[PDB]
Structure formats: structure tokens, C-alpha cells
Design a protein around this nucleic acid. Structure first.
Ligand SMILES: COc1cc([C@@H]2c3cc4c(cc3[C@@H](O[C@@H]3O[C@@H]5CO[C@@H](C)O[C@H]5[C@H](O)[C@H]3O)[C@H]3COC(=O)[C@H]23)OCO4)cc(OC)c1O
Ligand SMILES: COc1cc([C@@H]2c3cc4c(cc3[C@@H](O[C@@H]3O[C@@H]5CO[C@@H](C)O[C@H]5[C@H](O)[C@H]3O)[C@H]3COC(=O)[C@H]23)OCO4)cc(OC)c1O
Lengths: 760, 760
DNA sequence: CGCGCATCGTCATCCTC
DNA sequence: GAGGATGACGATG
DNA sequence: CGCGCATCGTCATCCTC
DNA sequence: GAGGATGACGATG
């Protein structure tokens, strides 16, 4: 028998014929790994090995409709290549011999995503063939993640904990050239030949023992065990925190030779890392209200001044260059676009100015132009929310031996409450609606004095619909409807989280023609659409209008939309998760966390300004002594000159002293006292240096005199003053667009509420 | 009647109903322009305007199979929306009234590609409905290409010749902020409202008069008028060259108000610009053997040192940042990959080192990994072929007010003859095979003395097949076949321009099973494939083997492949095109063009080294006079100090003098004599300055003494010395891969030639 | 570049009962 | 020997 | 990211005659 | 009033 249906399959020689019990099959993720596998098979052969590339995340089958199972074609190809049958038990070895392939070796990237894909495949095999997991049927191929090189020598490393241990236990570190490997395509032909040469180290077989592992597989993909996953991740996060505090290095895998691998260790040590990473990258933080993807772009934009505009494609390239982004520019351009939209419902405040078309409110925001068609630039509010004097306060990382972005930021407003937070993770998810900036500023000003904060309500910018609060953490939103004449009706505004094209295709189309059980309700509909406002004119029957009035126009046209707030899950200043209940709790927590840092900023700016003033004073004294003629540098050895300078009282660079004092947690230094060009030896510049040092002394005195607080008040005042101009320009943008002569239908407005709260 | 088939269509209100003669339809390219059109229609309305986005280059219908016409679905959608019929004449106004739309307004980018798309649409309409082009049925919408801004003032510009005229005729230039527009998506909502507000300036109607225009349309898309297009472009290129030489500014369009536009002017002024641009971007140059897309990347790589490796995505981002690339990063990543492949048949020499997988010789080179999976870095041969001292020799451009890449480069070898040249343009196309580098070096060394060059033969790197020359500019290539036993046969090497997967699917599959008229010839086939070499073992019938031997194995398995050389078309040092005939002609032309620049390089390096030495001498003299104590700068005004320095004999910066002398085609300057820090006032540094100036004097003396020639010989010697190490590493790469124990079948080889030359 | 299909937890409706 | 058909390739939609 | 289909001039075969 | 079904969303395969 042979296979000729799909061209992508590279069938082996004895596939389906005799000795099929030894014929294996390689499964690779994506299509790049197929190139590595084919390039490698040149050494082993084509008899017992076949390669078939996958597409991406495989459909979960433990809980899915049979129709959806039949819809996927990739699973159908997998069964057609292997030869499995749904209701056929495989107990005897003859049943295994019936199949066309003996073993299945999966190989993917050495990251969390490959681990997730492997878990999905194990679940797929176990859900419908439990007996095949006790005959050595599945196996894994692994690759190195980082290599070193120095004088024709290299050392392979498979796990980061092993690389960290090698760094901590070995001297002469950094002499080797580090080289990170992210994708399988990074390797070359020589590396592939070396990998397939050492089969006893990469090829790893699985092993099954004990029925408990079956529950473990369920523990990973049971839609009825959400709380079980919650506890399973909470215990792991607590253990990791305790181990980090005690300083004991945690355990890893793949270090020495491994003949087999238990499923229990496979799940409780590898997939949980994917779960933790996903929760870290898909849930915002209560401090900066951002995600690591957004944070990298915001840091890269802060690194350069960018006075002019900039293209999005080159911006993403620079972000990948400096922020160490390793998730594909395509997934990053969408995030950059999301950080700039300002239409109704998207964001009450933006950080990137909208130069171009960043998507209207018609096609789900996905109707944006190509990334090379659009331009962008930092808004005036970006550098105001983040004072430039806060870089020294926060802690950074050193991914890829490179000063990289920090873990959070310290704004002057809670960013979670201004731009919302919507994310789906593992075990927990997040859903936080928007609010109004002025109410937040008023509440913070009220709390700073000591008074009690006031209850707030989720609002939006440029929105005219009504919002009603019935139960705590529950809200209802209603749009705008009017009755122009006894026959016509007008829809002016739709509620948030509603798109004009979707609303039209899902409401006007079913109502225009008669459905299977309802007569055609509406008769005519016309659209008067703009970039921001909408206008629907619907003509119907007068009796139908009276009926809708008796029933309620909002219910008929689906204007009342409900929302709840029970997913208030965010990170902490330490890194743990908390289930928040009220917005005032987030406000008080942010207030205290911000209050803790005034002393740190004051203590950092103080001392540093004093040291700069002292350095200027030392430079002035050196210039004055040189003008006096005491210091002679005509033909004097560099060494003797340093010695005579020291006996004066002259010290090293205080900036270097502060850098050393910060880094605590080649001799003397007098370079800056001699790096000044001869231009400094004139009175025209001596006067400027004197006035500059006097200005620095005045600034230091004012800092010593002013309170550690009261800087917050000045910053808020400046922010409000800037927001006034920003909103003025935003309104002028519509005022220029304002046509003037246009249809302007006006009619009595019906405002209604649900008769029954129906509180749970 | 209504339309509900395609969702992308935004139907108007009176479409298909009454007053359809006034209902227009907007056609936009791509999908980004749909966002601009929809955002703009908010002001005009939804009654007489409808938008339908296109996909890209529309299929030409003047010469295409009816089956292919039926295959395209976009044309079917266009007819279904409009309502046209193939064999229905439209003469009376009632026939026009029968249609569902009155007019068609096309809008695209203001570049050459939009012009090409508009021409394709006009051809499509004229080919099957000649009568519709005399009733005001088609129209064009235009947008600005660049804008200026200074103090709430702006001036629109539609053509570059108009912008150049405004720059040349108006003072106070550069005060306005320039802003280039490339894509329609760049504009904002306010700009769209302003565009649709001034309908009398953008909306332009067409006009037809005289049957000659019909021939003009044929002149643009007649597959039987290739020579006519050749003459039509040659006359235009000659006219442009003469106008540039005379300095008279050429004519443009769209400047003042335009009620109509003739087809003759539409074709002889706009589409010809697209033809010229396409020929410029799709044909290599005889000087550097590159194309502008390759040239931009090669310049961007030259700008930075890049000692370490670099990612391809960030590299493309930097190229778009500095090289002013405006054709999409996706089209640029493929070019970057093409500039790095080194497998058999791709390139005899590469400029980017292959770190990763850049595609094997199996899937057409298209099996390369994702651009973020691969790394790259400049090869050691890049900076050797292009000496660093040649940037001053060539002329640059100032696209976007930015120092950008030059027009060509001056290597030490003809790059056209080493990496081939394959391109398809308009009116002309190019096809130049590869050659051997050592033969080129030997021929250049032979020509430099004065001897006669030798005939060469197209060769390839890492190739074992035979090459035969029968007619001039014609060649035949044969692979490698052997007879292992009286039954089996072995194929070792396939000819160039042949892919293993394609050769297998197009030869082994038809031969394995019996075709409609042939019995199954082969019986068994097995593959022993590697990354570089191939091995096919085919088992067949002994009688069939004798029959194939009687007929010829090369003919049976398609091993002999012919190639011709009649498309030797390249640019010139001036910019014109020439139809070359022999390779020796290209070699002699390159030799003379290179010989012309030795004097220029010598004259540039001379004088410049002398000026640097003079500047060092002036600095040393100033330091010596200061040590003597004659020059006093204690408390002296900046102005009086300059005056006393001048009376000494001290001059300005000679580097500035050379920069001014080059730029020919605020007073005194003594900054560098005072920008030296105090460290220079010690003997330890005075000795170093003295030795440095002595070294500069020696270098200048050697330059004055050596011949203007003989630098070419030293550069060639260094290049050969480096190529020795490069080839040694390349061979070692296979030697490490060399498995050792493997199947090594050896058999008698049959070498054959066509019995009849069959010369034309 | 556009549509192609996938995870993962809450939930607002949506179709039966 | 003598004519029509067609895909091959590369920068861009 | 993979396959989706298009131009444009020469030409090596490829299927009839 | 009471239960199962399902798509909605966003960073990534
Ligand atoms: C096809 O070959 C591979 C594909 C992938 C996936 C992928 C997989 C898909 C799929 C699409 C995609 C696609 O994502 C899409 O991007 C789109 C970009 O425009 C925006 C508007 O909309 C996005 C889609 O929301 C998203 O779904 C790829 C982007 O980069 C990836 O990593 C994605 O539809 C079918 O299955 C991974 C691979 O190996 C690692 C592959 O070999
Ligand atoms: C769909 O929406 C639009 C598409 C386009 C075209 C395009 C058009 C296509 C089409 C594909 C393409 C595609 O090219 C493809 O890229 C591929 C990239 O990977 C490599 C391996 O292979 C390339 C294909 O050889 C090439 O054909 C686009 C890339 O950027 C463009 O400019 C291309 O197949 C169907 O018609 C322009 C638009 O507006 C301006 C659009 O709105």
C-alpha cells in the first residue's frame, strides 16, 4: 500500500509493508522544522523514518462536538497516515502490527509552546486509545537551547536551570561566546548531523506506570476541574516563591542521560511552566496596567526621543532589536496598533498618536491598513505620566546579557482603571471595564488629604448612552432611540462592545425578511454613517410600532446590554495573584504603593544632585588653581601628575561613586578633570561654569527644603493642564469635520429600565 | 433588486432601482483604500456611491484562454455587481439605463502601480465593450502625494515635477515641514473630508476622440507588438536624456484644473513612467551586477560594522529606516534571503553568511524558515570586493532629504558574470548564466598587461555534470548516470535549474505507473538523498534497459538540458540600454570603466592625506608654541584670541576645505585647535602625536611614489588569498558532514552528445 | 496581506423544557 | 521538418 | 506563515501534423 | 423559573 493524497507527506520506504512495527514517524510543529528533519535524515536513511509537518495548536478532542472533530482535516490526515480506527481496541501485538507505523517521535521548539503542543498530542492519543500508552509507542526528540564557543570547544545545554548552574559553578565565565537558540530553523546542517549522530542523548522514550497519571492528564484538560488547576498552580507559585527566598536552586530535567520519562514528572515539571508563562504574558499588572508585550514597545519608544514621526514596521524592528522580543513581529504589530486606537469603546486614553487609519468603529478594528501604510509618534501625555526621574527607582532584568525593560512602571494614575483590562489565561482570566480620568484624579486628590473616597461608575470617552447600576459589580448599558414620526424610527447610538457591521448583519438582516417562524417585522432601513456617530432610519408599520412600544423598544432592537465584574484578578508588587472585589481596594493599594516611593525618589535625587554640584565645584577649583599657575602640566608624567593632584584633596568621579553604591546591592580617577578642552580656560566660559554651579546649588537647596509629598500635586496639576489642550484638539478635530448643513432628525427619546432587577 | 452574494461589497441605496444612470461605483486597490473610502463617504452620502475593494493585478483579457477568464472569480464579481453581458452591444442610452450603475470611479495610490492597474482596467473595459468609452462612463479620483506645513498653512502637490518646480521657483524653502505620502492609508479622517469636500479638483472625467487612441491601447497590451513597445520606450528614454542634458524641466500633469483627459496623453505620459520604473527595478546593471532592492540592503549593511550576527527582521527594519525602501518588508525579506543562498545552482559567491537554514536544493529554495528563525552577517569577502576608500568616488542621491545609497558600486570583478542575472521587465528581459571566478581573475590579469583574452564557458560551483558548447551563445548540460548491474541503474547528479522534488513528481511518478498510452517503464525507485548530493536507485527490466541504451539514457530520463544567451541586456554607466553579444565585450567594457577610476581614487587619496598631515602639523606646532609659553589663553576674549592666532599663519580645517571643494560641483575656523583636552599637554602624548604625523608623512610619500596602477594587482592577490581560506572552510563543512561508512555504489558512466547539432 | 483554525476561563444570550 | 500552447523564473501587487 | 493568483519577454520542450 | 450550547474577546501558535 502507498499514500498519494497529501503532497506535504514524505513517506518512508517500508511504510505499510513488512517490518512496519519498526517504521517510525516524525511529527514537527509548523513547517520550518520539516527543513531541519529532511536535512538531517540524509545521514540516518529513508527506511524507518518519515516526516509530516503540522499546522499549529491541535484541536482538543476530550470536550468537543463530533461535528467539529469531523471538520478538522489535519486530524483526518493524521489518522489516514497512521491507520487508527475509533472503536478498535489495541490489546494484542498483532493489532499494533496491523498499523502502518511502529512509533511516533514528536519534535518541536525547546520552549513552553512546544510543551503545550506535546501535551495536546498526548491527550489526543489517550482520549480514544488508552491501551497504546503501554507499548513504547510515543517518543520525544530534543534539541539544545543555548551553546558556548571558545577555541573549538562547545558545551550543550538543554534547560535554563542547567545553564544557570554552569554559570554559578564554573570560573572563567563570559570568555565563551553565548548564542541563544529560539527556533529549530536557527540550527545549521552540521548541527543537525551532530544531533542525529548522538541518538542516545536526544531520543527519549516515555513510560507509563500507575493509573494516577491518567487523572494527571485529566487534571490538565478537564473543563470540569477548573478549581483543581487553580490549586495546582497556586501550590507551584508558592513553592517557587519560597525557593527563591531561601536561595536554593530549583530542580530541572534533561540534564544527565534519560532512558525513560514518567508522565507524572512530565506534567508536574514541564507543562506547568507553560501554564505559568501564559498567565504571566496574558494577565495585566495592578501597578502599570500593562502586559510584557506592551511594556517592551513602551520601553523601546522611551529609549529614543523620536521628535518626528516614525513608521510602524521600523518601530517593531527596533523593538525586536532592543527589547529582546522573541514572539514574531506579526504578533507585535497588532499590539502596537492596539496601543494607539482612540475610537469610541477602545481606549479612554492613548499613548501613541493616531497618524493614519488605525481602524474605525465599523469592522471590529481589524480594518486597519498595512503596517507600512501607517505612521506613529509618542503622545505628549506619555512622558508626563512617567517622570524621567524614575528609571533609577525600578529594577531591570538582564535577558541576553542586555540592559532590558523593567518589570513594571510607576505612573501617576492607576492605568488598570483607565484603559480597561481584558485577557484570558490559565486558571484565571481578567475583565476590568473602563472609567473616567477626572473621577480618578478627584478621588486621588481626596485620598491624599485623608478623606474617604467616593463610589465610581464605569464610564467611557465620547459616549452618550445611559448606564444603570442595579447589583454590585453589575451594570446595564442602553443606547439611543427616538420616534421621528408615527411610522419612522431613528437609532442614534449603539452600546459599547457593539460593531456597526456586525450589528447590521445580525439584527437588520434577520428583521428585513421573514424568518422561519416570524413575519418580516421591519420594512425599510437606511444608514447615515459617519466615522464616529451612526444614524439608522427604519420605516415600519404603525401597529408594529405600537406593539414594540407596549413591549419596549430597547428589548426589540437589543439596546440594553449587561456586564459583570467578577474577574478582578491582577498581579502584585511581589508577583502573587489576588482576587480583588472593589475598585476602591485597587485605588487604595495603588495609593499606598505610590506613597512608598516618594522617599526613594527624594533620597535618590538628593545626594545625586549634591554629588553633581561637588563635581562642578572640584572642576571650578581645578580651573582656578590652573589660572593661578600652581598646577604645572608642561612635560609632566601622567603618573606623577595624578600623585600631585591627590595631595590637593581632589577626589574621584562622584557619579562613579553613586554607580558603585547602586551596584553594591583601577586606582584613582581623575579623567574628567583633564578631559576638558582648552576652551574652558577663558573667562567667557568660567562665568558660565560659575553660574551653572550656582544654579545647581539653588536646585539642591530647594530639594532639601521642599516636602517629600506635594510633588504629586504639582504633577497632577501639570497633567490636567496638558489634558485640557489634548481634549481641546480632540474636539477641534470633529469641529473641522463638522459639515454644518446635514440631515438633523430630532425626536422624543424613550428611556427605560428593567422592571425586575432579578438580582442573583 | 439587491445584492447579497459577497459580504465585502458595500451596496448603495438606489443601486439597481430608479435613477441608476447617476449611481456611481468606487473601485479601490487592495483593502486599505476601502477604509479611506468608507470614512470619506460619511460626508457625501450612501445614495450615488458604492465601494468594492479589488485584490491586486487584474487578469489581462486581450490574450487569455476563455477557461482562464472563467477561472477568475473577481472578474465574475465585477460583472455580477455591474450587470454587463458579453455579446450585448450598448449603443442606445436605454442600454446604459439597463445597467445597475451609472459611472465607475477608480482610485488607487499616486504611484506607477496604480497607473498600471488603471491601464489594465481600461483595457478590460475596451476589449469587450468598445461603445461604452464614449458616454462618460469611467472616471478617476486622485490624491496628493506630498504636503507642506508652516504656521497653519499647507500646499498640495500631485506630481514630483510640480514639487520640483515649486522648490526651484520659491524662496524660504525647507521652512515648511515636508511629509511624503506613499499609501492611501497614510491620510487621516480630516484629510479625507477635505479631499471629498473639493470634488471639482480630484474627480476627473475621461474623454475619447479619434480612433488612433484605440491603437494606443493595443500599443500597451499587444503580445504581437513587442518591437513597437521597444521603439516607444527607446524614443522616450532618448528624449528624457536630451532634456536632462539641456536642463529644460519636463512637462507634467494634474497641475491646474482638468475637466477631461485624453487617452493619448493618459498613455504617453503616465503608463510609460510605470514601464520605465519597472525596467529600472527589474534589470541589473553592468557595473555592480545588482538591482536597486539588493543595493539598498547592501548599503545598509555597509553603514554599520556588524561584528556579531544580526536577525533578518531587524535588518529589514533598519534597511527601511535608512535606505528609504517603500515596497513592503515582505518583498524585501525574500531579496535578503536571495542574497545569501549558496547551494548548488543558486550563487557561485555569496555576500551574506548562511547562519541557519536558507533553503535546500529540494523545494525550490522556498522551503526556507521564518525570517525571525534565521540569522545573518556580512561575509569576509564583502569589504574586500568593495574597498572602503571608494565612497567618495561615486555619486549619491537625496531621496527624502537623506544621504542615501549610490547608483552603483565599483567592485574588483564583474558581478554580472559571477552570480548570473535573471529578470523580466518591459520591452526587454535579461538572462545571463554563471561563470567561474578563477577564469575571470585570470582573464583580467591577462588583459591588464595587454594580451588577448581567452574564450570562457559557463561553469558552476560544486557541480559535476558535463557542459557542451555547440553553437555560439548556446550550451547543453548533462547529468550523471551509471549502470550498477544488468538490472539496476543509478542517477548521481541532476543538471542545474532542476529541483529534486519537482524532478521526482514530474518524472518518477509518470514512469512508475502506466500512463494513458505507455506501459509502466520503471518498476522500483529508491532515494538516497543528502543536503547537497542526490542518489536515485532505479530497478527496471533488462530488456527495457537494453532499449534505453539503444535510444540513449540521457533522452529517456531527461538529463540533457539546453540553454541560450540572447537576452544580454544591461544598463550603462550613463543609464542607456545596450544589447550585448559576447561576454568578452562585457569584460573589456568593465575593464575600461575600472581603469578610468584609478586616477580619480589616486587624486582623491592624495591631497586628502596631505591635508590630514598638514592639520596634524598645525596641531603639533600649536602645542609646541603653547609649551614655549608664547600663546597666552588665561582670561582672553574668544574673538581677540582668534585674531592673534590668525596673524601666526594658522589656517582653517583642511577637512572642511576638501568638503567645500567637493560640494562646489561663518568666518575663520579654529575649533579643532582648541577642542583638545589637557591630556595632550604632556610629553607622553606629544611623542605619540609626533610618531603619528611621521607615519602620515611616510604614507603620503609612498602614495606619491607608487603607480596609479598596481593597486589592482595587490587587491586581486589579497582577494585570492582570502578565497583560499573561504573554499577551505567550505570544503571542511562537508568533510565534517562526511559520514564515512555509507552505501557507495560505483558503475561505468555513459557520456553522450546530440548526434546532430541542429544549429539554427 | 487576507482568510485560513487553535488554546483558555466567564458569561450573555439562545434554543429546548 | 513546421506550427500553436504553455510554464519556467523574480520583484512586486 | 503557507498556499492562494497576476504581470511581463524568451524559450525549451510538448502535443499535433 | 431551570438546564445545556455557544461565541464573544487577545497573545500567540
Ligand atoms: C500557516 O503556517 C503556519 C501558521 C502558524 C500560525 C497560524 C496558524 C493557522 C492560521 C493562521 C496562523 C497565523 O496567525 C494569524 O495571523 C494573522 C495576521 O493578521 C491578523 C489580521 O490576523 C491574524 C490571525 O488572527 C492569526 O491567526 C500565523 C502567524 O504566525 C503564526 O505563528 C501563526 O490559520 C490556520 O492555522 C504557525 C506556523 O508555524 C509556527 C505555521 O507554519
Ligand atoms: C490579500 O490582500 C492583498 C494582497 C496583495 C498581494 C497579493 C495578492 C494576491 C495573493 C498574494 C499576495 C501577497 O503576495 C504573496 O506574498 C507571499 C509571501 O510569501 C512568499 C513565500 O510568497 C509570496 C507570494 O509569492 C506572493 O504572491 C501580498 C504580499 O503583499 C502584496 O502586496 C501581495 O494571492 C492572491 O492575490 C496586495 C494587497 O493590497 C495591496 C492586498 O490587499
Amino acid at each position: 500500500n502507498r499514500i498519494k493524497g497529501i503532497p506535504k507527506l514524505d513517506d518512508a520506504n517500508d511504510a505499510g509493508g513488512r517490518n512496519s512495527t519498526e517504521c517510525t514517524l516524525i511529527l514537527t510543529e509548523g513547517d520550518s522544522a520539516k527543513t531541519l528533519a529532511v536535512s538531517g535524515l540524509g545521514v540516518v536513511g529513508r527506511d524507518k523514518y518519515g516526516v509530516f509537518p503540522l499546522r499549529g495548536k491541535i484541536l482538543n478532542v476530550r470536550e468537543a462536538s463530533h461535528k467539529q472533530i469531523m471538520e478538522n482535516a489535519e486530524i483526518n490526515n493524521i489518522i489516514k497516515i497512521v491507520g487508527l480506527q475509533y472503536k478498535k481496541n489495541y490489546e494484542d501485538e498483532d493489532s499494533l502490527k496491523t498499523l502502518r507505523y511502529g512509533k511516533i517521535m514528536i519534535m518541536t521548539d525547546q520552549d513552553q509552546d512546544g510543551s503545550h503542543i506535546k501535551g495536546l498530542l498526548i491527550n489526543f492519543i489517550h482520549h480514544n486509545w488508552p491501551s497504546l500508552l503501554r507499548h513504547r509507542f510515543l517518543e520525544e526528540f530534543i534539541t539544545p537551547i543555548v551553546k558556548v564557543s571558545k577555541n573549538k570547544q562547545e558545551m550543550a545545554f538543554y534547560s535554563l536551570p542547567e545553564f544557570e548552574e554552569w554559570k554559578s559553578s564554573t570560573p572563567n565565565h563570559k570568555k565563551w561566546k553565548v548564542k541563544y537558540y529560539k527556533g529549530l530553523g536557527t540550527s545549521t546542517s552540521k548541527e543537525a548531523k551532530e544531533y542525529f549522530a548522538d541518538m542516545k542523548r536526544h531520543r527519549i522514550q516515555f513510560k507509563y506506570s500507575g493509573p494516577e497519571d491518567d487523572a494527571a492528564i485529566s487534571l490538565a484538560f478537564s473543563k470540569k476541574q477548573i478549581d483543581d488547576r487553580k490549586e495546582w498552580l497556586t501550590n507551584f507559585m508558592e513553592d517557587r516563591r519560597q525557593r527563591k527566598l531561601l536561595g536554593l536552586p530549583e530542580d530541572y530535567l534533561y540534564g544527565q542521560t534519560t532512558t525513560y520519562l514518567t508522565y507524572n514528572d512530565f506534567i508536574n515539571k514541564e507543562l506547568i511552566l507553560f501554564s505559568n508563562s501564559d498567565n504571566e504574558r496574558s494577565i495585566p499588572s495592578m501597578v502599570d496596567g500593562l502586559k510584557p508585550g506592551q511594556r517592551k514597545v513602551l520601553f523601546t519608544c522611551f529609549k529614543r526621543n523620536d521628535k518626528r514621526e516614525v513608521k510602524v514596521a521600523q518601530l517593531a524592528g527596533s523593538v525586536a532589536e532592543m527589547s529582546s522580543y522573541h514572539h514574531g513581529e506579526m504578533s507585535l504589530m497588532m499590539t502596537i496598533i492596539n496601543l494607539a486606537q482612540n475610537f469610541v469603546g477602545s481606549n479612554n486614553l492613548n499613548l501613541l498618536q493616531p497618524i493614519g487609519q488605525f481602524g474605525t468603529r465599523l469592522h471590529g478594528g481589524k480594518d486597519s491598513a498595512s503596517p507600512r501604510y501607517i505612521f506613529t509618534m509618542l503622545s505628549s501625555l506619555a512622558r508626563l505620566l512617567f517622570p524621567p526621574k524614575d528609571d533609577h527607582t525600578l529594577k531591570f532584568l538582564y535577558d541576553d546579557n542586555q540592559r532590558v525593560e523593567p518589570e513594571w512602571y510607576i505612573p501617576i494614575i492607576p492605568m488598570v482603571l483607565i484603559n480597561g483590562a481584558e485577557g484570558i489565561g490559565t486558571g484565571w482570566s481578567c475583565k476590568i471595564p473602563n472609567f473616567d480620568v477626572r473621577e480618578i484624579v478627584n478621588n486621588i486628590r481626596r485620598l491624599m488629604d485623608g478623606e474617604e473616597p467616593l463610589p465610581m461608575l464605569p464610564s467611557y470617552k465620547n459616549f452618550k448612552g445611559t448606564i444603570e447600576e442595579l447589583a454590585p459589580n453589575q451594570y446595564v448599558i442602553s443606547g439611543e432611540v427616538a420616534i421621528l414620526n408615527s411610522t419612522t424610527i431613528e437609532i442614534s447610538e449603539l452600546p459599547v462592545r457593539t460593531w456597526t457591521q456586525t450589528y447590521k448583519e445580525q439584527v437588520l438582516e434577520p428583521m428585513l425578511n421573514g424568518t422561519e417562524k416570524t413575519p418580516p417585522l421591519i420594512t425599510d432601513y437606511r444608514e447615515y454613517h459617519t466615522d464616529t456617530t451612526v444614524k439608522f432610519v427604519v420605516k415600519m408599520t404603525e401597529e408594529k410600532l405600537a406593539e414594540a412600544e407596549r413591549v419596549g423598544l430597547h428589548k426589540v432592537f437589543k439596546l440594553q446590554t449587561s456586564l459583570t465584574c467578577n474577574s478582578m484578578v491582577l498581579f502584585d508588587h511581589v508577583g502573587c495573584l489576588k482576587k480583588y472585589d472593589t475598585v476602591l481596594d485597587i485605588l487604595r493599594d495603588f495609593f499606598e504603593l505610590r506613597l512608598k516611593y516618594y522617599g526613594l525618589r527624594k533620597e535618590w535625587l538628593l545626594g545625586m544632585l549634591g554629588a553633581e554640584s561637588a563635581k562642578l565645584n572640584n572642576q571650578a577649583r581645578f580651573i582656578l588653581e590652573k589660572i593661578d599657575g600652581k598646577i604645572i602640566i608642561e612635560n609632566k608624567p601622567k603618573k606623577e601628575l595624578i600623585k600631585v593632584l591627590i595631595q590637593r584633596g581632589y577626589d574621584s568621579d562622584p557619579v562613579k561613586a553613586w554607580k558603585e553604591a547602586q551596584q553594591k546591592v583601577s586606582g584613582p580617577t581623575f579623567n574628567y578633570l583633564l578631559d576638558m578642552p582648552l576652551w574652558y580656560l577663558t573667562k567667557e566660559k568660567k562665568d558660565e561654569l560659575c553660574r551653572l554651579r550656582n544654579e545647581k546649588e539653588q536646585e539642591l537647596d530647594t530639594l532639601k527644603r521642599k516636602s517629600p509629598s506635594d510633588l504629586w500635586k504639582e504633577d497632577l496639576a501639570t497633567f490636567i493642564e496638558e489634558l485640557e489642550a489634548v481634549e481641546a484638539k480632540e474636539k477641534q478635530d470633529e469641529q473641522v469635520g463638522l459639515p454644518g448643513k446635514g440631515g438633523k432628525a430630532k425626536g422624543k427619546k424613550t428611556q427605560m429600565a428593567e422592571v425586575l432587577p432579578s438580582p442573583r
